[PDB]
Symmetry: C3
Subunit: 252 residues, 3 copies
């Protein structure tokens, strides 16, 4: 059987495919560990700038594999359910088709950007069973869409589509079913044209800044900016611009 | 009759401000009765959700100024009714007609909003040289886009349910007079679910805004633990697997 | 050569105009200092309640003047690029036409309200040169429009129009090109109609509340509120309302 997580490098893009189509890409031990390792690979390899996560067979992820867990498999890695608890540092785009409920929705929420087929289905249903979502969905959904919409969805546990969520800026690209990956690939290419460390540092500032004291916010930002300003890539950006040619990025 | 009416319908507490002739302004009896309602909601295991609405087609005109001026102690230990310490369990505002000033701050202390199309909101304090102090400024810029909340707070202008629907401030937008009926359906969607679960989900959504990132999952975990050992959690798994409805206890 | 920053008072409104249209109103030292001193004037003058900032000759601001930086001008003032890092205490409206990229966009984000001509062009393009935007755009854009859209624009560096951005609440008044100043003045008058101290304190609570611990938020608000309750304007506001006459504010 093919690997349950596929990993393919396309220039500065790392394409991560959950590959259990007959289980709608539910997260068992091999998927959780494979996704954690992809995150590590993305962040540790200089010639990568961005990742895309997607699912084989027109479904993204049914969430935790309850059957695998009940048999005795560990579904959590060091980064949580795949990487829900500790998403990667470098930018990652979720390319979502079809079923993406529950842990699948929480995995989507751990990503930075979302490209989705219009029929793609999301949800945080835990309260229906007298449970509460614990893989970050409650920490993040209320910051991606309007507070009262997120609250409604979390309290009713109802499903919602990419098509419905597009008005709230939760869907960076809304396309026809079947188009999410090719669209994600284009968006990734727009990002990887830019300075590798600069796109990473930008993300970092955006995530960390909502934790900073206003008194310190500019100094904290400045700490992250400094290495960028003196990077080799920053030199090449200016040089390439003067010379009317494409920059050649190195990630240093 | 009583200036605040309280009615239990299974797991729903219906709370009605009952001063229609005063457009349901908050005097001492109202503020105290709303605070007492919040206590009853939060202390009663057989309640999961509340709905707050106003008698006679208006929600709440805010602070009763005649009461304030005549020396009534209008603020309760939870603020203007419960603006400052809102209930722990989920609550829905069912808003018709006039909902200005303190009334808008009362709406903003709720979690979800069902409104008649013509319902009127606003934070008009600056027009009188005052500042809104019952939570409006702390919450409105987190419920609609920052610059829209800023604008509304600085001009003091009124805005309707219809205008605000565009920003995700209105969970259900209904023909005028239908807010309570629609809130009762929305409430039933939530009371269908685990009582402890819906309260804890709300709790995490609220308190997460002020957690250090590096401690967010640990803080969250402290709220989840009592849930995963709850009797409702066990009943939810057994009810699903026996293809029947769950019978909740709030334990 | 005219002043690089024009300043005009209309009743309680301070109109601040960046005046280097030859350079598309790029910020050199003269502009940065002019802008900082205009902020100071707004905040220290009791008979002012609100400002409007705009650019002469049909664009807002091209951002940092590169010729100036390169040659050695100390462009950053005490308040940043003009006043990006420490904006005015009192409310300020950006009246934006035409080119408003990079530093210009961050200047806009340092204001509280935006009125823009529909073809106005914003952007945070630093990543394209292997740089990161450092004048507050990354601290602020994600709180004005949806998180993932801000993240996207930050990572792509892609320009966006006022027309595009209006759906997100980033544009308080979207108007035809050429009408931004006129409309900003009408909005400013709607604000100056209200208590000067009350509008400033309202802005302060909105900004600073973002960083208060919940259990202290009402007490901290209480501190900013106390001076308002006992203010002379508070009395005047109630008596003018009672009488249904224009209140005459004093700023105390």
């Amino acid at each position: 059987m093919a690997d349950e997580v596929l990993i393919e490098q396309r220039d500065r893009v790392l394409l991560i495919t959950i590959n259990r189509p007959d289980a709608r890409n539910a997260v068992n031990r091999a998927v959780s560990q494979g996704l954690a390792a992809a995150a590590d690979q993305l962040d540790s390899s200089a010639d990568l700038s961005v990742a895309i996560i997607t699912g084989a067979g027109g479904n993204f992820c049914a969430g935790m594999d309850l059957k695998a867990f009940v048999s005795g498999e560990a579904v959590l890695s060091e980064r949580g359910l795949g990487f829900t608890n500790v998403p990667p540092r470098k930018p990652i785009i979720a390319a979502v088709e079809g079923f993406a409920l529950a842990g699948g929705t929480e995995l989507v929420l751990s990503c930075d950007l979302v490209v989705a087929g219009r029929s793609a289905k999301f949800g945080i249903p835990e309260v229906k069973r007298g449970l509460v979502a614990g893989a970050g969905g409650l920490l993040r959904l209320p910051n991606r869409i309007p507070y009262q919409v997120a609250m409604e969805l979390a309290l009713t546990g109802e499903s919602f589509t990419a098509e419905d969520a597009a008005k709230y800026g939760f869907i960076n690209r809304l396309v026809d079913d079947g188009q999410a990956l090719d669209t994600a690939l284009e968006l990734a290419a727009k990002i990887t044209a830019n300075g590798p460390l600069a796109v990473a540092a930008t993300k970092r500032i955006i995530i960390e800044s909502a934790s900073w004291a206003p008194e310190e916010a500019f100094a904290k930002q400045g700490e992250i900016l400094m290495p960028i300003f003196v990077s080799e890539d920053a030199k090449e950006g200016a040089k390439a611009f003067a010379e009317k040619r494409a920059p050649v990025w190195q990630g240093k």
